[PDB]
């Protein structure tokens, strides 16, 4: 339908985030304890890093569809102009298994509880919320990969067509790292 889009749509702790804390503040607690220093080094690790408040802490680079079948690789480059995703739509073949892979850089401090929330709409009716806990990471030069658990695209006569997506990243602090909309289209086959 277009109406009963709202029935389909009807298919929808508390942890509390830590008091805020800086990496420098972290490195100074129990500075005496050699096992605890090493623990920090294993996680942070062997120092040294950037720190000028000016750069953002987290920068997300690409969101990529991993899926054996697929004939092209499918990617949103999120360094370029996010504005212009409103002007193109990606096909995803109905009924396929996929994972989503997110690359990002952490610069300066710990991201605590980074997640990716994704709202999916059709004919102005929100039909899915989804979020993947990407988790906690400390700053380093080399970027991070993160794969979501395996999922399958939907299928059937209804499921085929055009969806409107609002994605964002946030964390347990509510930092607004990134937001954008894009379009998706579900077809019998792949484009390429």
């Amino acid at each position: 339908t277009a109406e009963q889009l709202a029935q389909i749509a009807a298919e929808n702790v508390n942890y509390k985030p830590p008091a805020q804390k800086s990496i420098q503040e972290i490195q100074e607690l129990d500075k005496d304890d050699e096992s605890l220093r090493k623990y920090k080094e294993a996680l942070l690790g062997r120092v040294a890093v950037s720190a000028d408040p000016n750069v953002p802490n987290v920068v997300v680079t690409r969101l990529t569809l991993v899926c054996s079948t697929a004939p092209g690789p499918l990617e949103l480059d999120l360094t370029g102009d996010l504005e212009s995703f409103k002007k193109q739509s990606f096909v995803l073949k109905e009924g396929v298994e996929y994972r989503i892979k997110i690359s990002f850089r952490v610069n300066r401090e710990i991201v605590s509880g980074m997640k990716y929330i994704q709202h999916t709409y059709r004919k102005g009716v929100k039909i899915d919320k989804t979020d993947y806990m990407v988790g906690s990471y400390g700053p380093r030069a080399e970027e991070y990969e993160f794969l979501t658990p395996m999922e399958e695209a939907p299928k059937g006569m209804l499921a085929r067509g055009s969806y409107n997506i609002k994605s964002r990243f946030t964390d347990d602090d509510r930092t607004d790292h990134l937001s954008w909309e894009w379009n998706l289209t579900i077809k019998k086959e792949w484009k390429d």
Partner: protein, 190 residues
């Protein structure tokens, strides 16, 4: 020689025996003198259901001032050993207050196994009377059992690092649960 490697992280209030369990699992000799706060991570070859399997083991700092540092090791994790001490009803109380919210938040569909540390203290007199000093008794196995049920763990295993009893068994359950693979994200969506 080489093998599947599964990541295992161990959480729990402090004083619950996390570090000791790990030491004894590697070294085989319960600390004589000094206990480190955190044991360096390492890996253990372990053979379960006649399957060569490798287990990467991470000790953690359970104190609240590391509430932000600690979750750095959750990503990648295959299974979580959530610990309390049998000689501390206060630690068992903290399981659905602090630990499982944190773990179910940071590792959504990752299995958990409830680990009751220091069995040897259940029927140790000094212990029985120090708890009785504040109107408490040691934790009952049937109390731990339904905690496991309450938090939805893979199972409830209890042990004693000092006496070695049940330690071997603890990690085989962990492996068993790491080699398990069917979970999430419950049909959503759609």
């Amino acid at each position: 020689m080489a093998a599947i490697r599964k990541k295992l992280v161990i959480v729990g209030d402090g004083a619950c025996g996390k570090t000791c369990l790990l030491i004894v699992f590697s070294k085989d000799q319960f600390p004589e003198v000094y206990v480190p706060t955190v044991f360096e991570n390492y890996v253990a070859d372990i053979e379960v259901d006649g399957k060569q399997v490798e287990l990467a083991l991470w000790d953690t700092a359970g104190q609240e001032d590391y509430d932000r540092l600690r979750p750095l090791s959750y990503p990648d994790t295959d299974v979580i050993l959530m610990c309390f001490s049998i000689d501390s009803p206060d630690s068992l109380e903290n399981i659905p207050e602090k630990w499982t919210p944190e773990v179910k938040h940071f590792c959504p569909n990752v299995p958990i196994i409830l680990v009751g540390n220091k069995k040897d203290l259940r029927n140790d007199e000094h212990t029985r009377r120090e708890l009785a000093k504040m109107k408490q008794e040691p934790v009952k196995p049937e109390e731990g059992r339904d905690m496991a049920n309450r938090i939805g763990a893979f199972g409830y295993m209890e042990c004693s690092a000092k006496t070695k009893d049940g330690v071997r068994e603890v990690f085989e359950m962990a492996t068993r649960a790491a080699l398990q693979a069917r979970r999430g994200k419950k049909k959503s969506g759609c």
